[PDB]
Amino acid sequence: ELPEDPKWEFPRDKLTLGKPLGEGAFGQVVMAEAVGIDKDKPKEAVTVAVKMLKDDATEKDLSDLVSEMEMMKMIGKHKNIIHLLGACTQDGPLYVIVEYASKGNLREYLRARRPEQMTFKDLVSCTYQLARGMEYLASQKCIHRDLAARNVLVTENNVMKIADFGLARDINNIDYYKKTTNGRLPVKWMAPEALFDRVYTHQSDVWSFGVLMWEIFTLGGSPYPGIPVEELFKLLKEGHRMDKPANCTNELYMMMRDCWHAVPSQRPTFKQLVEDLDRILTLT
Amino acid sequence: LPEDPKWEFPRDKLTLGKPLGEGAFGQVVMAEAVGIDKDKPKEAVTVAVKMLKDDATEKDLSDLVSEMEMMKMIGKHKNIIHLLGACTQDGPLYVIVEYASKGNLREYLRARRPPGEQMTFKDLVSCTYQLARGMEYLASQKCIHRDLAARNVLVTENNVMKIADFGLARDINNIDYYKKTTNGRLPVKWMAPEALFDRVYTHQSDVWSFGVLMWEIFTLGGSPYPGIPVEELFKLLKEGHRMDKPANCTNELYMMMRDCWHAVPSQRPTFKQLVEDLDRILTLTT
């Protein structure tokens, strides 16, 4: 059923599943103890996160979990991306072992720290880290397609980790102009071209990053508040764009607006966002 | 969205209330619909409303529209959650359906487990009988549910069983036989083998699922194939494996479950036969 990949395979007998961390779209995540997952420490038990199918899993759920694992293999390691640690794929259920982020997704993290409150600098830092994570991802020819605060995890060290690669794809593994393309992307975080033209590029992720930025500076606010999903794209075409967040600087808001530029090629690249953000952070 | 006056319902006549639970492609909230029952035009009827979640995808929307259309074609039946109305024009899509105060059957049964209002043996047979009738009716309407399971059954104030969640249901003819993608979104542990192996789906595929539902009922909400991961299930099924007899049922009722799990679809009973046997078992028990 599943091809061997020795380099990533982890022995089932050295993994001990713990309490669940939450049920998701196509899978379940549980806390776990993995012995020797760090090959330099063969006897150390490391706390990890394990993603597996739910009891009511579908064939497509498995296909998605497999695909998510493969994406994480090809992406590599980076400070601001949740990292793949190994997997149990031979004779037995599929387990995707990834690093554990003790503080949950960014949205929850931020909503809980609404007046250890968050400082302006903290917010710019979170943003900078995520921009840096996306710059790396883009250079790996990978489009995330599901960028959002709920899909960012925060470690014990408050390090931002881009996660949830269930919809991620290689830039060339997209079926352009097909009526079903991008059909499973959350609408309020989606670039307009993703639906109107049925394409997806790094510039599409940049639009999503803009929405992420708005979530960050609203401390976990809900995008397009009061506007139903059904009438969003009509408003987007007409030029509607979310208003500027209070904890936000005019400059940072202009950056969000640039990310929400109608023309894909007129939006900044992740390379540029990192540069401007590094500058702003350094000033702050 | 096209206009369908007969089903349309005034947004100003609807008042959304407390949520009942977020789901796969939607959200259900309790609400008051004034005059939905045209018998009592001024009466505020408590109802259930399904709508998109804030993080909805395009696919979620077409799935809700599809569930709505499916419910429109099925009709009215005692053991099938009934579509009451809908707000499809100028605004968010609201699918207004009959309210079921006791939630889904799984939660209902697990909450009635012995401390070791408990379910009597007859209550379990009655429950099964009611769902067989609902499916028999559904099948006569040329509709295949495809997602039969305890969690997809609602229970009213008076314990009437209601088959719900028609998000995956289809007219017998709206299914692409033989295509690699067909039946890719159906929960594996409740699915008939042919649905995956042959990429087809018929009323007999639904009775296989009905068998698993029966098992959930007599285990008072147990999880099918305990200890068996979904990725290993079909290998075991091909090898003959079948769930064991629940402690709470007779060998006769277990034999019924087993018959529903025949490898050959045509060798499984029809919903009409299931209704007749359950009717007999229920009556003789009384």
XYZ file of C-alpha atoms in Angstrom, chain A residues 1 53-60 62 91-94 150 179 181-189 195 198 222-223 227-231, chain B residues 52-61 91-93 151 180-190 196 199 223-224 228-232:
68
model
C 0.000 0.000 0.000
C -6.609 9.218 10.348
C -9.815 9.629 12.336
C -11.987 6.573 12.956
C -14.455 7.844 10.339
C -11.660 8.564 7.857
C -12.328 8.453 4.115
C -10.106 7.241 1.289
C -9.488 10.885 0.382
C -5.713 9.017 3.661
C 2.445 -2.643 7.928
C 0.327 -0.668 10.364
C -1.664 2.597 10.429
C -0.076 5.735 8.969
C -5.028 28.738 12.895
C -13.475 23.829 -12.587
C -9.198 23.661 -8.773
C -8.728 25.449 -5.434
C -12.205 24.235 -4.475
C -11.147 23.280 -0.943
C -9.383 26.499 0.062
C -11.023 28.623 2.790
C -12.671 31.520 0.931
C -11.794 34.406 3.289
C -8.048 33.725 2.994
C -11.318 31.030 -8.008
C -8.443 28.620 -11.284
C -12.032 37.046 12.254
C -11.433 38.341 8.716
C -19.616 39.509 5.791
C -20.933 36.083 4.749
C -18.673 33.836 2.712
C -21.322 33.765 -0.003
C -20.956 37.421 -0.848
C -21.581 27.751 6.028
C -18.819 28.174 8.611
C -16.694 31.343 8.515
C -13.801 29.270 7.109
C -15.961 27.635 4.431
C -14.562 26.584 1.065
C -16.218 26.747 -2.340
C -16.757 22.995 -2.080
C -18.571 23.366 1.250
C -21.064 25.699 -0.387
C -27.772 36.845 1.668
C -26.102 33.805 3.257
C -27.562 30.381 2.500
C -23.892 10.019 14.090
C -11.109 6.036 -9.594
C -12.449 8.994 -7.608
C -15.974 7.698 -7.023
C -16.889 7.046 -3.374
C -13.601 8.602 -2.261
C -15.289 10.684 0.447
C -17.254 7.973 2.253
C -16.228 6.860 5.772
C -14.380 3.589 5.209
C -15.589 1.701 8.305
C -19.237 2.065 7.195
C -14.147 1.021 -3.373
C -16.445 2.174 -7.858
C -17.075 2.325 17.492
C -17.040 -0.164 14.629
C -8.641 -1.985 13.733
C -7.164 0.992 11.798
C -9.031 2.134 8.700
C -6.041 1.477 6.450
C -6.082 -2.223 7.346
